[model samples]
Target chain A: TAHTHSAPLVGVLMGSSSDWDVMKHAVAILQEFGVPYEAKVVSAHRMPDEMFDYAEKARERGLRAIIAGAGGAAHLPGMLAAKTTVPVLGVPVASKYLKGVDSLHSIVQMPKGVPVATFAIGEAGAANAALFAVSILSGNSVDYANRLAAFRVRQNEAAHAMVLPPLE
Target chain B: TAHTHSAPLVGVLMGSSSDWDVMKHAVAILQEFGVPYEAKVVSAHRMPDEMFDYAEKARERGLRAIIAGAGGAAHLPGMLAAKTTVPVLGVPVASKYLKGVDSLHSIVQMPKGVPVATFAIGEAGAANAALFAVSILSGNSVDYANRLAAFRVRQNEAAHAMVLPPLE
Candidate 1:
């Protein structure tokens, strides 16, 4: 079933159409949590003015957090942070050349003034960023906190359920 | 006496003074190669105009590559790439909370149009970015190519020099 909430609390953005490959994981976690979030393509370099507008209007539009994913020379999250007070989470999508190292640095290395919560590279990073957004919402809603707790329990169970083969 | 050269070919930049902790590795690599380089603080958020000017003028100033390091919403390398054609090598500095994952993502994930050659996170990344810069210069100069080959040989020999204890 689709999420029931009408207004999205989180805004999941990417630099290009291709970033959905990694950003889909972030969407999945938000879906599982039943959190209202909207995903979109907002390139920092290609569409600088539009990206700035999105960041500027995010707070008034009721977005509490932003999860931005990009592959190489990723700048969406930091640029967003520069324009707004909303907590920005950056996910480094793996690149073809240096893997996601470029993406990670671009997102995480904000100057002293602004901060963007960064996650691991690729899918894990995307998923964690979503989970982190839920955690942020959990501060106000006990229900969300419970859901996050249950999710962690299930995650642990899945880890324990893993089967390892004997070494030859 | 300090190594002297008429002009610097490599530019090592960081977002803040704190970033020197990680960016020093990049500087060290350049020193080892005796490749003339200049290091400075060029914040994307704090000094946007100056940073743009730096990137725009980098090529004209005889810089072959730019190594940018920052942490927490890092945007230096990507922004620099946006303004110039000079190859940017991004290094992800470790952050206190996320441990450089954010930095890695910010630097690595660029859009299709712009490119920033990213390296591993933290000290290793800084060192590798410098090594990669050497590789870039090696493409044109036989002397640099020879130095790079020797450096790799030494690196491999150092790895072989390791002594592991018994796993009893």
Candidate 2:
């Protein structure tokens, strides 16, 4: 959060720093709600050891949720879920050629033991993952709960205020 | 498969007979390949115990893969994955409002212990799941492998031969 003096409540992870383009939306939403969070580059494929190390310690570190976005064979979220009970929220970042369809398959097609709450692809997915994490954290924090409620009202109002333009 | 045989290599399941609208694509591909298969209506929510019964028996039944098509909060594939090691190929059937987005999430975002190889949404997913199953079955059956190879050629040829319509 912008003006805070506490441990980060959420962790935003991506395979590379380049993912910041799509992942910034998550940061924006978290900041908008003043939810303390940290962002990091955690590679599930290349940095397997470091990745698991982070996953295993997430819960103990007082992290409530992990919002991970990766492209292509997006295994970061699934791999993290394997190592910890802390909820994993996966965002399928857009990729080359296949336009992130491959990323969707790799990230989402996880086996039965651990659950990763997935969202729509790309920016929307990234933003929602953070929003969802806030919902989870709101269970204990009244401030976050109120913030999410306010956002929902604004969103509902925006949805209803729409009108179609006359046929051009 | 349209052609009768002593044993069925594939198992096709849908939550309801209505799902047949989408699921029939899988059966169509199986019949096209002359791959013996059995189709059944197995509701994961309505018939949890019976669903598990089918899943648990899949491997022993000599089934190489199970293609399950479902809609809305589609729990059939994930629940089935939990009960069996047999590869579960899930097709997200289009649902109301959300279309197959909910189906995709419920089917794909499974926990770590089990995996369901998921395809795209609706009919495309239905066909690809069966095609993927054929590719898997090809591991042991030379006939299946040869058929898959030939189909790949036809698919590639069709893609290359496609002609764009003249600009309006």
Candidate 3:
């Protein structure tokens, strides 16, 4: 769903087409926020050479940050982080083999300086990762920042009203 | 493997015997820290009736906190928190249909007041839940607190060393 927009601010990359079902959450979130972004099918294990090239040129390609998602052996995010200094946000796309625990640990528990700013596995994580990317990129744009702030306020208020009453 | 002591400080409960493989990570973590704990199979759906009874008496059972893990429709952790005010840590076991994404969202995104401090999901989450429980209980215990702190420090240091060198 990525069209040649006015130089995408964020790039959403995934490990495989199979992850589309889960990774679609990222696209929906970005679209909801009206943020122009790009998504690619870039696997770490399947296309290591492309992975390195993408990471190396991500910043120069007018991207502020990269949202790299993968399931099972989720090396895409960490490997991208190793190749570039761009802030990499990792989304574990609910791996089938080990229930994403393997992916979560491999991505989130990254060695120190190379922070993956991990999110919960699957759909919610995909959505949150995109949202976080927006927040990070919006730091310089007041309008976008205000929108995100308002969204947070609405979320808090909704939860506040949903609290259950005490039992008799 | 939770047979080392009496009056367990932490209690780990799974929804079914099938989850023993995933839930065992908690036991391993607790054992690694030499923390005494108990593990039991307490179903939420199969025996929702008994879940309520077990949760109602959890605190009185001399447990500081409870680690409740389940897959798919993981209502056990949330239900446990509803019955008892004790801090309930949730681990999303890998499910058949959604590979634990449903489990993760169900557990972590609790409806307000009934808070279930949730972990990542699968093996890593189970391990971290135990570590987090220990960290929480370690507040008053100097020895355990120091050990946990030391472990965290070493973990961070290892990550810091993984930074890549400048490109040629």
Candidate 4:
């Protein structure tokens, strides 16, 4: 479940293994596009040095983008962005008390210089993060570009066909 | 515009005077309850030490709550939360490109030790943050408590009375 079918272009990691439930949505999207990826736990607070090393070596290892999700004071995405230039996509996992409100802040409020492209707060955010990663790879693969283009069309149609209930 | 009608119970500040456009919403709610408040430009990035100084003495200055609004890496609320025990309310001011997305992240995501009660993005968030601060003061002031109670009824009715236009 961690490694990919081929050389991984994306590395998906979360603060805790408990986050796999939400982070898996990101992986599912990657799977949909057949993008090789690696996913696992890379806690920022528990193991800062290791997380740093992963970020530092990410580019040289052929990874294009990294999706990182965490709850509470989620330092994973920002710290990774600090270490590497590779685009870091952040997903805010829902926390127990604040309901991922703190997680969203921690990951998204990165200072002006180092930026992290942040998504919503929860499962939808996780999937959208993956979709954003797919967008990043769009230009590199013609098939991906076409699929992304077609996805928007379908997405629009789904919205366009929506019907709201009348007042009773 | 900065000073209060009497001894201010609330201190509302923003990163720049430009944010006053957004921060004013908080003041409006404060005004609604006849809550004395002081509003000013308190840029966290432009002058970090000054902001800290203001926060350090905030409680002694007789403020029950602090409402902070800033755009792009808005550390004002989180930083204020760190310095003062007085509850800090954060409003994410919409930024140019990101539309306060970065501001929301910065203000909402505080570490475990400190807490900044964060609201939504832009105007609604500013208003809600003030209302939350009012709610916090409810136990102390019966009038405020009653007003807040009435506000809740108005809010619920507004939500319940909503009607959606039927598709042609």
Candidate 5:
């Protein structure tokens, strides 16, 4: 219960360990920004109590924001947000049955009052979730904002640097 | 090529044969509505010329609308819309790398003058595309409209009929 520091700036949670395949992009982006983060597996459907407890104690644990990734009936992120006041970002971890459309609809189409800032379903979203978290945290920290801005510049440059094969 | 007297009411095209898995839903929906459709395999990247010819002649060949489904860089639907003025619907088939996010971005984020009516990615989209096509065709034919209305009522009834487990 001692809220001693070195606490992560971001908390990454997924419905299952299987999400590591998609959630790694988030980890990589946070690493690139030098943002401190820790990841855990907490299923909204299978482990509702655990999800509620995690969200309630997240801020006291020194976490500034939460990013929850889930596929199919993706209710984790929204439920987490309802349980806490921190900015909750949801990454729709593309489901197999409907290929993440189910995940996207379930996550993005949340009703008012309880809002979950949803990213595109899958890797791009996983990548963006970290960037967005950094952006949110950066509003208060100038150093983090500078690093994020640099990342944005690099992204733009890489996009513009692309070349197409010569039309034959 | 023989321009059959019965023009394709719904023109269904996919990025590759692999997409037959998801594209089948569109076909099924069309079948359910008793709408006649023509299906083909035309890749935006692999078969550019065929893609052009298909879209260019769609309407002239008696096709009322076009439904293009593709995954991973789903340029097929947007490109089809660019070549023809017919109402074009894009369905994002789930992709491997990014879980159809790549397909969704490629299709949904189309430029001005060329619009691709996008659907929810994957199966729901596949089903909706057929329903949308039926709805579009319904605008011209009263019989089709009645069929669609009946289908919608049945769909509603099915949803309302669902029962919960353990009545005790």
Candidate 6:
């Protein structure tokens, strides 16, 4: 089934085309919750000017939150945050050399003035960033809040459902 | 009484003045190894111009490696990597909110073109980044390699020193 909402509430951007592998977790969460969102490749260093323009117009375009992911010297989220007032959530996509630790550091250590709400490295971070965006939207829509609350309940249930196998 | 090196081989930078609390761990390691290094508050967002200049001049300034740390949308390390070929070691300083996961993401996720050697989050990361820098310098200087080998031995010794408490 197609998502119902017309205008997108969240915008997901990644530094490279390959980042989709990790960032798809975010889109999956948004789809599960029926959150209207958009995703695109927006490199910070590769397409600096275009990335800036995207951030500059994000709020005016009606995006409430932005989820950006990048691996290795990730500057997309912070650069976006610098340009937009929209709350930015960063996901540290795992890297080859440092395994996402580099991505984690690049997104989290924003200076005092600008803030990008950082999450865990890789898939978990991407999913959580989407969840956090839903939480942010829930402040305005009771419907979203209800969905988020229900999601958390299911999450807790899944955790409770875990069973360890007997020792061999 | 003083370090024998006539010039600094490594440069340590943090996004804000407050980062010294965590970044100092890198300094302490450098001190222990008698590795001449310099530390500074070179913010990517606040002092963007100076930060770029610092990265640009790093190689010619006699710096073989750079260790950068920041919290919340950390970009210092990545930006440095973009400008300089000097190996950049990123340390994810713990942020007040995300517990340094944000810092970790920002530094580690560099795009394909540039690479920033990333370490763990917080104190361990800071110290490890310094060690990584020493390792980089070790390629040329046997002295650094020897010191690094000794440090690893001491690290192993410390791990051996740990004694488990009685089980309840």
Computed on C-alphas against the true complex, the DockQ of each candidate is 0.31, 0.02, 0.02, 0.02, 0.02, 0.29
TM-score of 3: 0.52
Candidate 5 reaches a DockQ of 0.02
lDDT (C-alpha) at residue A75 in model 4: 88
CAPRI grade of model 6: acceptable
> Candidate 5 chain A: minimum summed lDDT over ten consecutive residues — where?
A1-10
DockQ of 1: 0.31
Give me the candidate number with maximum DockQ: 1
Candidate 2 chain B lowest-lDDT run of ten: B109-118
Instruction: Give me the overall lDDT of model 1.
Output: 0.84
Residue-wise lDDT of candidate 5 within B6-122, one digit each (tens)? 656887888777888888898888877777787888888989999999888987887878889998867899999989999999999888777788888999998789999998778
For model 2, the superposed segments whose C-alpha errors exceed 4 Å read: A1-102, A105-168, B1-6
lDDT of 2 at A159: 71
Candidate closer to the true structure by TM-score (higher is better), 1 or 4:
1
Question: TM-score of model 4 relative to the true fold?
Answer: 0.51
Per-candidate local distance difference test: 0.84, 0.76, 0.83, 0.75, 0.83, 0.83
lDDT of 6 by residue, B1-168 (tens): 232245789888987779888888999989998888888888877666687688878888899898998776677787777778888898888878789767766666655677889899988889889888888889999998999898889989999999999999
Superposition error at A72 for model 2 (Å) = 6.4
lDDT of 1 by residue, B1-168 (tens): 232346889989997878888898988999999899988888887776688789879889899999998776677888888888999998878888888777766666666687889888898999999999999999999999999999889989999999999999
lDDT of 6 at A40: 85
- Fnat: each model in turn: 0.63, 0.00, 0.00, 0.00, 0.00, 0.59
Which runs in model 5 stand beyond 4 Å of their true positions?
A: A1-168, B1-6
Q: What is the TM-score of chain B in candidate 6?
A: 0.90
lDDT for position A101 in model 4: 74
Q: Which model, 5 or 6, shows the larger DockQ?
A: 6
Predicted candidate 1 versus true structure: per-residue lDDT over A1-168, tens digit per residue: 332245899989987778888898999999999888888888887766678788879898889899998766677787788778999998988888878777766666666677889999999999999999999999999989999999999989999999999998
Candidate 6, superposed: residue stretches over 4 Å from native: A1-43, A47-74, A80-111, A115-168, B1-6, B156-168
Q: In model 6 chain B, where is the ten-residue run with the lowest total lDDT?
A: B1-10
lDDT of 4 by residue, A31-106 (tens): 9888889997899999899999998888667777789999998889879967765667788899999998788768
- TM-score for each predicted model, relative to the true structure: 0.58, 0.54, 0.52, 0.51, 0.53, 0.58
